[PDB]
Design a protein around this ligand. Structure first.
Ligand SMILES: [Zn+2]
Lengths: 302, 72, 288, 63
């Protein structure tokens, strides 16, 4: 079978572009974080960047450190650096320094998406040049709502009507890297609940249509109430039954997938230390029996 | 004319709103964020009605032409 | 302000058509059930029908009784009757280039078929129903049809649409839970109903924890959950102001049988209060 | 033979649709999700057949 973790990705050296996405409050950010950390530790030789466009600006909250426009090394790490950036503000400034543009642009899908994206890229490059240091792999903390990457269809719709450039040529450059499974992949975050799962398939399908590799689902907030020594809450037990019920469905539906079943750490995970402690279970799958204390110790501090 | 002038204004206000909403956290601001979305689905209606009226202010002007020459 | 319950609907005499809808495991069925029961008890003079198209056929599970094609009186009740019916099977029995494609066509055919079936139930029984409560299917667009046999159809639909647009005649009740993804799906739904010109005034918010007012104060996890639930309640509140949003409690495990369904459906009428009403729930669970 | 097949697809797709409408997506997420995947397939096949026919008109018409 396929392994129930992300070990093969964390260790991979071929990937430049790893996207983490998940709609609706399912762990997305600490997932982005956890992956980034694991990769960095597993590959001390490389330079990693966690970039986030999420408007909630919560890499800063996760790390309890204040990141921003300027790529900065995560404190207490020597190969992980983070930037939080709002692309609208970046795109808007470009329009500024530069209503008729909206009749043609505003309407077309992926146009504003692509412009916005290109802008981010440009910004990254500027970071490397000035620093004199370059990154080997970026990890995108995608925004929880929208279609950041629906601009990966532009090159198709723009050649069609061209018979009827700078941009379309950029996009085809990008799309070439993003279609290479060894170069770039997507990691879906979700929770074992119908509505989230549904949204998750929708996403997978959409990525597949863009010809983006998607091989990995992270399933957060699992309870494992059977293997719990408090065996306390009759309510959480009853919840665990739902969660379980769908795991079984997920299992027979994304067989060739790496579906990682992460545990629920009650409350919140913040700071490098705990984020780290916790991100280990993306590599070597969590086991309620032996790994329990690790979680009960993260919570009891909280 | 005044119809194109407005269509552009709508198409522009709608756009500006879109980008503003893209800077709000839908999970941390569900009410505000949901409101702005409701305003967008409105503007899309207004803008698709203006667009339909203009297309039909062509059919209205255009009928005043074929009426001229070949009504003769 | 607007009352945080469904009292005005349960007591209403003008309504013929009450739809209960909710996507994604949010209480929809025991909600359909609970409303039906409360209405029937509140208006003993009228005859009520709970009909369900949900493929899970779970009115039978809720009531722990076996209903089906044939409208049957809920045991231990004298004005509530239930039918579970699969419309595809009904439409298929009656039976693509032209139809299959068009939206609401198969929807409407399917619907009309249900209607027909109901009428057949009344005629034969000699008894008629005063109000139906529709347990809608959790996925689809049952009612997107609200937008010689051709004419026949469009003429039927316009007949229906006339009754369904009358706010005093028919209304929709949304079910959801205090969680982003469900809320979102919920607005989507409201918007869609508003577009059909269907009255929508009431949201039921199931599975709330009220962990603050709980004497076990046990689970640090359910506490932390309660904080999310709360967080959104506050959003819902300032967004559906003129709505009747009922904030129902979480009865852990499952509600089955007339007795408990009843005990529980009282809180749709007089809003639940964690302080005084706690035991009622803790007594439903502890039996379970 | 193109029309013959287009009808067959359009019909199999329909029959599947109605069968899926009788399954509980919450109680049968795997099965149910599968059948949906099959539908989004058939819609492709059927929209390709429809496009080929429309272009087997343009092909005959050019003659
Ligand atoms: Zn608990």
């Amino acid at each position: 079978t396929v392994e129930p973790n992300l070990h093969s990705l964390i260790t991979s050296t071929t990937h430049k572009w790893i996207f983490v996405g998940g709609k609706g409050g399912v762990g997305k950010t600490t997932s982005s974080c956890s992956i980034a950390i694991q990769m960095a530790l597993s590959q001390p030789n490389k330079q990693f960047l966690l970039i986030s466009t999420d408007p909630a600006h919560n890499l800063s909250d996760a790390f309890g450190e204040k990141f921003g426009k300027d790529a900065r090394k995560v404190t207490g790490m020597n190969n992980l650096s983070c930037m939080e950036i709002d692309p609208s503000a970046a795109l808007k400034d470009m329009n500024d320094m530069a209503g008729a543009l909206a009749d043609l642009t505003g309407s077309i899908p992926g146009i504003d998406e692509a412009l916005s994206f290109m802008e981010v890229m440009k910004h990254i490059k500027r970071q490397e040049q000035g620093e004199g240091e370059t990154f080997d792999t970026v990890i995108f903390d995608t925004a929880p709502t929208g279609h950041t990457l629906r601009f990966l269809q532009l090159p198709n719709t723009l050649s069609k009507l061209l018979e009827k450039n700078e941009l379309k040529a950029n996009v085809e450059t990008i799309r070439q890297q993003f279609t290479d499974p060894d170069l770039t992949t997507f990691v879906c975050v979700c929770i074992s609940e119908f509505l989230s799962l549904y949204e998750t398939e929708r996403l997978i399908q959409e990525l597949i249509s863009y010809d983006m590799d998607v091989n990995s689902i992270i399933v957060n907030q699992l309870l494992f109430a059977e293997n719990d020594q408090e065996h306390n809450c009759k309510r959480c037990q009853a919840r665990w039954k739902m969660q379980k019920k769908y795991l079984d469905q997920i299992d027979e539906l994304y067989e060739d997938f790496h579906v990682v079943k992460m545990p629920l750490c009650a409350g919140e995970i913040r700071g490098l230390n705990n984020l780290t402690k916790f991100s280990q279970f993306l590599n070597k799958e969590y086991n309620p029996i032996t790994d329990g204390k690790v979680i009960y110790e993260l919570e009891d501090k909280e | 004319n005044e119809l194109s002038k407005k269509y552009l204004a709508k198409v522009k206000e709608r756009h500006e709103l879109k980008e503003f909403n893209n800077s709000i956290s839908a999970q941390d601001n569900y009410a505000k964020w949901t409101k702005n979305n409701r305003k967008l689905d409105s503007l899309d209606k207004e803008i698709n009605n203006l667009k339909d009226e203009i297309q039909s202010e062509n059919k209205a002007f255009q009928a005043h032409l074929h009426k001229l020459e070949h009504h003769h």
